[PDB]
Amino acid sequence: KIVNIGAVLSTRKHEQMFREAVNQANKRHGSWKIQLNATSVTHKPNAIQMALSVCEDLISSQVYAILVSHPPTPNDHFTPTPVSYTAGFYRIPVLGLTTRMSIYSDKSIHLSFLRTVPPYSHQSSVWFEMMRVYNWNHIILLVSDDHEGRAAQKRLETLLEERESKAEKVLQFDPGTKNVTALLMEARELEARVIILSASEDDAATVYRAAAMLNMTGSGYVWLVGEREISGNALRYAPDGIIGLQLINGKNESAHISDAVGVVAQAVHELLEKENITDPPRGCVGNTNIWKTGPLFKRVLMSSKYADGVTGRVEFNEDGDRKFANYSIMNLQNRKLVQVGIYNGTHVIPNDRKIIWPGGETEKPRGYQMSTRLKIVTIHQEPFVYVKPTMSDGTCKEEFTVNGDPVKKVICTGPNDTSPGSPRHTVPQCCYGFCIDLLIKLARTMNFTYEVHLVADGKFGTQERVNNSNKKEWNGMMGELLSGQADMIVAPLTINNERAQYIEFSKPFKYQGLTILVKKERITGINDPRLRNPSDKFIYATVKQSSVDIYFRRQVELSTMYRHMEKHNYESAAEAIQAVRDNKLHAFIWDSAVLEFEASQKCDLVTTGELFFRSGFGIGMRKDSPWKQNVSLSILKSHENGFMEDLDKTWVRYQE
């Protein structure tokens, strides 16, 4: 009765420590006839002969559990891989002791690998625990390493799924490149200042240099990294006040080997309690079959609970990782690594030392430096947003109304419609009218500046499917909203169901419905049954990728018109007005007050009598944001007085 245990080990002193741990494992574990034998191998510079030596030693040895504890002296990459693959061929368990790569967490590669150390991805758990201490909710994730950092990003999005509060922006790039300053500018432009990095040494030193070039060590900035960033040459160029994580006894090798041998020993003494016990044979002689109680012994190792340990209480999770590991939380007090906190698995306790921040005093960084400037996008709506080219040099002609009130114009930026069809300049331009003056009143109410720009292409924005993999995307003003290019859509935006699922809406400032523009012979709205089956004499359509398209796509009895007007959709409303003025159409489907304004302009343009889809123009907004309550309250304050009536007296009520 013997049990063979293999060990892949570095030194010669820890070989004696492994033999001493085998001797101590046979001390108090009963007078049973079982014994424990020790087998140790050393390094080779190339990994092929490492796997060759391991298989030639351990096929002849018939071991049960293999301990692998490679310290990376020449290279920090994938040295415990071959022993893991070799024993995972025969499904023999490998206990990794010094490696921490998250590629070992995926058991689709390593079928029979466990480890008594926690990987870097569970550091993200601590980073989630960094959010509950200071009540932080918006973070900026910068992942450098694409090898294992996607697993840490997935773990962070999994742990933030319980709060249902996503990160503000996640960024991924390639290790090795240096010029990553545009990523830093994208991290700059957002209101949050919490920066979370997981990287190797060299890319961390690169982004430390590039952040020192860009004032990112000042006040408000919060830097939160792991173990690989507080060492090497990255520690030489680390910004002061940084918060890092460190493994308590993570390189203490002797006690770690002893605790692993105790784990293996109690697993063996539990394995002898059961029957149907086999041995992994000499696999080099024609043995392609796996060891039959492989998953059984693996299930023993996964559910192996322990209360003994020199480092502490060791326990495996559902993925074979070290649970409830104590961490040190380190601060960099002017190029001095200072321990400022301890991490049990459920809670953080700081010590008597104070957490000196990267900025000025010891006050906590409320990392929401909210912007007084808001990116505003709108479309050229003729009764609402007049867009007109500048007079002399980027300036607007000061035009007066009928009462001598100066028209409050703004310097927006207007690109042309066809960028390859003509030399496209993207010149600034003048914006005024209804919604522009509403925005000027809103900026008059609350102290915030603004930058009005326009949409790249004249579409509101629809749920449009992209060609590869049939994936849904958004375009137009909503496509520029969700891409971060916009912050607040003040525009004639139609409220419906599909938009409010993704973005938020204020209370509507305009109440109107859909109606029909004709040339005057009665039509009498949508309830004319002859338009239900149209022909070449009923030529009518709507704006391409408008809200009318979605509203007619939902209602199934309006499908036939939806299968007609899809052949004649136009890019903008004014093109349809000019087409129906020359009698190239017969009707048009659009909102109420715009067509009433066009009827006030041109007497031949006639709106119909019926009315449907009584909805409201409101302000298109972002997600959870501090511009939800007071914007709606300011619109409602504009509704309770006669200011909306005065804006109607400017353009809506105004006849000609």
């Binding site: 190339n46 070799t86 061929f89 392609t288 499908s559």
Partner: protein, 499 residues
Amino acid sequence: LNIAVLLGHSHDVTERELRNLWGPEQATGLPLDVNVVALLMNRTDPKSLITHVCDLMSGARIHGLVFGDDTDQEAVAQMLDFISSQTFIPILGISGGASMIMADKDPTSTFFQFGASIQQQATVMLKIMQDYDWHVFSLVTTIFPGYRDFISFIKTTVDNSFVGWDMQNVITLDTSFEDAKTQVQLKKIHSSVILLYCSKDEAVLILSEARSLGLTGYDFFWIVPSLVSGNTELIPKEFPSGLISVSYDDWDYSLEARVRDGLGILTTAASSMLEKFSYIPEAKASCYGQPLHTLHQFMVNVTWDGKDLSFTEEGYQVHPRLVVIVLNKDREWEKVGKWENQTLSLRHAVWPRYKSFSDCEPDDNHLSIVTLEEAPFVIVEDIDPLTETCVRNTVPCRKFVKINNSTNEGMNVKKCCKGFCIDILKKLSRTVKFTYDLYLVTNGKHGKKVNNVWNGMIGEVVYQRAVMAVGSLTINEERSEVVDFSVPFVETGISVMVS
């Protein structure tokens, strides 16, 4: 180039046809030194595998490696992935354990399999579910590794469709089931289609628990990936007759066609990379005592013999060969669904019950119903190409379309029915609570006794090929003689149209 093709098999297949596999091929021979070496093997232990790989690398500096397998040992492909991570040898697996799916690779690794990823197989399964309009479903997974990416890709794919997949909860497990609290997770399932992601050792117990809890009706459906569908011979009794699986094992493309495609990929990469730089093959000297232009970033633009055998960034195939199989009442696997560049091609647009899981199923609610096109009653239209789905007021149907007169063979092209009688059928299915298989007639018009032979819907109902004709149909004396009618619902006599 210097290319070795190894076959670790059990069924004895000779090797000189692999030597002839290059001879009449490569009509435009751009490389100047191409020699293939075919080897056979019966033992797949990694010591001997690495030994033979080092012997072949010392064997006149072999630069390309092809490995086939007939067994289920998937770790051999991982050992080949480790070998390619060190010796810088492009290695292509074929079948068996040589092409079973592993998740992520290394940039030093140039090993690439012949198989489809679990994400593309999830796209396959959701395409199958889209083509039958089985919208409401459930997802049941376990703690087998590779489940978080599976559930994540399903959650992204539901959020990237116009279908509106009314999905139930995602049910996982914890341990070997006590049948106490996992049973509570299983009792909440009441929808039809269940996607099951678990290993073959677990799937027998899970389907036995589902059969013991009445989750194996013909209303229900069970679709599994290739994780449980391994050996075609090994079929336990607990598999439900009506199981739909997907695997890339094709009986039309054997191992010889696969190694021919692998040699085509290797010769295409060698002849196309030679046009940029000449001295591309630079093998490692020996395996004892330790590059700019590699084929790791050149494998994307490959096309040999018309086959689009392009590769992905994760190491998979862009257009891989998938096979959609079912489990019939004969307890065997039948090849059903084949594949286009992107979409599915079904051999049977008619999906029958596959009712007999065993003899313990006495129920009956499906009704074979034929109709006929009438312009105010039954409007039959093409399916919407934007969604590949009949719009919600319409119902799916088939039409046995024949392109041309002399050929009797036709295709059951799926179309969408709407109108008045379709609304009547939907409200009857709401009230009486039954199902149906609505289809069209190709014999002709409503009904006429052509020499003691009825045509159209009357010929369907009298000869019992259709259960009832819910579609629009006039009633007169002889029609009331041969079949039976219901109460009338619309005052339809005759009339005369004039100016």
